[PDB]
Amino acid sequence: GWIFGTTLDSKTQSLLIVNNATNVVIKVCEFQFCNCTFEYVSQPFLMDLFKNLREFVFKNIDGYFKIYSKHTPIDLPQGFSALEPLVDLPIGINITRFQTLLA
């Protein structure tokens, strides 16, 4: 997953993708790492199976947090490939730091 936000005093909560069958819930509420019960249930993003390269080049434009996703089967190999848009989320927050989630 992804744990986006600034500092740890206000908001600072993001994506919760689990790859079983559901529960990609995006939450923008107060939470302390190491007052809101938001949710967004949809399909899992990371569907693929000869190594595969899942590439995300997501952005935000004044809160319009959008994700472009593509799984490409093959250091980064050469050659050109496309990446396709997936969703659009109005997260409405200011983000300056990031960290991966591993389990």
Partner 1 sequence: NYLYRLFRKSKLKPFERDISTEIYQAGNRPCNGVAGPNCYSPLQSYGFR
Ligand X SMILES: *[C@@H]1O[C@H](CO)[C@@H](O)[C@H](O)[C@H]1NC(C)=O
85: partner contacted, choices ligand X, partner 1, none (Cβ within 5-8 A by kind): none
Are 2 and 93 a contacting pair, CB within 8 Å? no
d(CA 87, CA 67): 6
Specify the stretch interacting with partner 1 by CB under 8 A; choose among 17-25, 46-54, 66-74, 87-95: 87-95
Residues facing 96 on adjacent strands: none
Out of 10, 20, 96, 100, the only residue in the binding site for ligand X (CB under 6 A) is: 96
Residue 41 Cβ, how far from partner 1 at the closest point, in Å? 23
Q: What residues between 10 and 69 interact with ligand X by CB under 6 A?
A: 35
Please choose which of partner 1, ligand X, none residue 92 contacts, taking the beta carbon within 5 to 8 angstroms, the exact cut-off set by kind. Answer: partner 1
Which residue among 48, 94, 98, 101 contacts partner 1 (CB under 8 A)? 94
Distances (CA, A) of 81 to 15, 19, 77: 26, 24, 11
Alpha-carbon distance of 52 to 72, in angstroms, equals 6
